[PDB]
Amino acid sequence: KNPKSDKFKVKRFHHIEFWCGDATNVARRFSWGLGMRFSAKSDLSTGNMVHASYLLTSGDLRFLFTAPYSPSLSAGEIKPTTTASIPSFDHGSCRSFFSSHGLGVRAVAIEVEDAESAFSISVANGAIPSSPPIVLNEAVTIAEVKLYGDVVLRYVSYKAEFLPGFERVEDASSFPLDYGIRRLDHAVGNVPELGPALTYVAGFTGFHQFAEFESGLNSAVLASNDEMVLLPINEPVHGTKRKSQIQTYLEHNEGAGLQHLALMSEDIFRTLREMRKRSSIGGFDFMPSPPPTYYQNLKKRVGDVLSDDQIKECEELGILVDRDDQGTLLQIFTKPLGDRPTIFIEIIQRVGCMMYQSGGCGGFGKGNFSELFKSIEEYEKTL
Amino acid sequence: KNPKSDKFKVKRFHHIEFWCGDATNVARRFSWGLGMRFSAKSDLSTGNMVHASYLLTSGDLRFLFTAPYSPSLSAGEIKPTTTASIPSFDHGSCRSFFSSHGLGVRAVAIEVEDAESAFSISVANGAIPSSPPIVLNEAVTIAEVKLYGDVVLRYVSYKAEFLPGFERVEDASSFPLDYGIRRLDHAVGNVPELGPALTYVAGFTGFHQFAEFESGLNSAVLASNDEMVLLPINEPVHGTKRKSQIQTYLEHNEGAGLQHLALMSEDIFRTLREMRKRSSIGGFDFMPSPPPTYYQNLKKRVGDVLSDDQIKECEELGILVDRDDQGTLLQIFTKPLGDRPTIFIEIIQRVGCMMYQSGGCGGFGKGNFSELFKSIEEYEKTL
Ligand SMILES: O=C1C(O)=C([C@H]2CC[C@H](c3ccc(Cl)cc3)CC2)C(=O)c2ccccc21
Ligand SMILES: O=C1C(O)=C([C@H]2CC[C@H](c3ccc(Cl)cc3)CC2)C(=O)c2ccccc21
Ligand SMILES: [Co+2]
Ligand SMILES: [Co+2]
């Protein structure tokens, strides 16, 4: 059931912004590790005396990395005379965010029909304002409201390449890396209490619950009208045996924040081959693979969707597989992206739900909990 | 003239410590860009609740990358009960350093015969104490004094692998990258006033002036007894036509600090080939190459040291060449390592002065200023 109750016209995920201490080094690591190319910049060389911002792209996926310069470079400026290309940026907020959370997502940006209207309607419906709408070069409008913790939901709207004040990156500096990643599928937050977080966000967006099919947490998913903007939220489940990874996150992050980004690949086998080749030479590490008993049980679950050769290829790369009632999902998780056990990345590919592919095809993998536990039991029995 | 006036026994450069906001991402970028392997760690997985520290090595070169965790993880601890593996570390100092300077060198560490004696003699002779000697697991002693700006000179001494509390990195996580870099040759500071900086440091070390052979700056070099620990210092020259790059550094760094690290390669052609292949895929960029007229003048200067084939190989890679009265120097400079136009790296190889090779063989390249200017004039004439 999709009531299509969006309070303003939402299009697609637009970009994710990381707040960094040094944007150069994080962006270069991510570029190599994920196969994203350098496509735009806003920094001292472009006249920005406030922040250094570097944009990576792969297909439709846009990762922005921003760090502050010394406030002394822009001490004469006021907001009317700022050289910042992102007017919501504030040195104090950025330094406070990073000292509090370390490397993490500051903004989940969605493209909307009219960012000023989205902002007004959102705040009229309970959203906590973070940055009021501002029009950039009479071309783009940007506004921000709080989402959870210190993460903001950023509205972007275009009258008619990233943002004014950003420069195209000279092709000699822009190597065409591509491991197959094509778009952001979903962005997941961790909170202390799921209920109030859901009520708040669904309250001001009109996003509806997406609805699914005991260890770790409780979650739920909010979705836009066409279910292309997907925002899951997790809360911990306390008092288990094995400590909730959601609670570990909240401790090490100093509170709520973005837990993981799920990136859709047009060929998850190629993506995982390319990323795993680079894990020990600057790229990203992946979580430990499930036991072969897990893959020794995949034939009985998705043997009609993947050949035995494709299932053995899943086993080589450590891919997990889950299944909805309309689709099938292939997924895998990285280890945390930075020093703290907080944010990580998921690589995903979905098969089914063709009409274009509808959003959320196959679910989010929650059936992999029971499957993994069964795998462990069976493997211990075979030991 | 080498008066050999060291006030305590100094051995060799031991390590350089960068203070970071996220040590993981900087260390992975540097590892790939420079061809250094991951060899030790001290972090949450080793019981360190205070800081994340990752050690990269290439030959004898040791780069340490450190970032703070949330203070809340170690809120119960006191200095007697600390889980930090580097007892001089302080969350407040590290966050203040990084917000003030961005990514940069916090410590230039030298191995000494007795770090407690070095510290006492240094402070007795004018050094400003930064961290008093502390003995780690009855095995290693570490102490720190201020060097310039917020950079410290760190003394390390061993009774008899990096530091207690650091763990060997599991070989699966430790890929054996190597582009030929083998040791730190020199470490250079930028200061507002050269005279007082020299007086202070030579005052407490007993290091002597190393002594050489109009645009940018004035410099001088302090050296240990065998001239294997080399510490150049630069000051700006004001009132030129083209603004001093030393003054630009001081502005963007918010004051004095470490300007560049010069890394000796056992094969500078292989190193530069390997680093340049990776410049646009996560590694380091190099400064623009001198005009071919420069290389069209190398035969008349070092034609007796390098064949014409080796000189054309210098031209491909953009290497500069200078010459002492005892040796010849091959060198090249990276673009700044991070967001700010502050710290960069120099790759160097020295030929001559065999007895082992004596330190500073060939000088530091200061003759390349005049040579480059002449190159520009000649190239403009040929245009
Ligand atoms: O986005 C996700 C998501 O990524 C998982 C994940 C959690 C980890 C699970 C898992 C990972 C690895 C193994 Cl070996 C077993 C299970 C797989 C599904 C969920 O369970 C989930 C539930 C509800 C809404 C969204 C989501
Ligand atoms: O360590 C150095 C050093 O690295 C340079 C450098 C400065 C930049 C010069 C240069 C670089 C590039 C070109 Cl195209 C021309 C000159 C080469 C020497 C010095 O001039 C110097 C002088 C005195 C003590 C130490 C040092
Ligand atoms: Co997910
Ligand atoms: Co030098």
From Swiss-Prot, chains A, B:
Residues 12-158, 183-335 form the VOC domain. Binds 1 Fe cation per subunit. One of its GO terms (cellular component) is cytoplasm. Its EC number is 1.13.11.27. Pathway: Amino-acid degradation; L-phenylalanine degradation; acetoacetate and fumarate from L-phenylalanine: step 3/6; Cofactor biosynthesis; prenylquinone biosynthesis. It is found in: Cytoplasm. Coiled coil: none annotated. One of its GO terms (biological process) is tyrosine catabolic process. Its cofactor is Fe cation. It catalyses: 3-(4-hydroxyphenyl)pyruvate + O2 = homogentisate + CO2. It comes from the Eukaryota. Fe cation binds at residues 186, 260, 346. It is an enzyme of class 1 (oxidoreductase). Homodimer. Belongs to the 4HPPD family. Catalyzes the conversion of 4-hydroxyphenylpyruvic acid to homogentisic acid, one of the steps in tyrosine catabolism. This is 4-hydroxyphenylpyruvate dioxygenase. It comes from Arabidopsis thaliana (Mouse-ear cress). The gene is HPD.
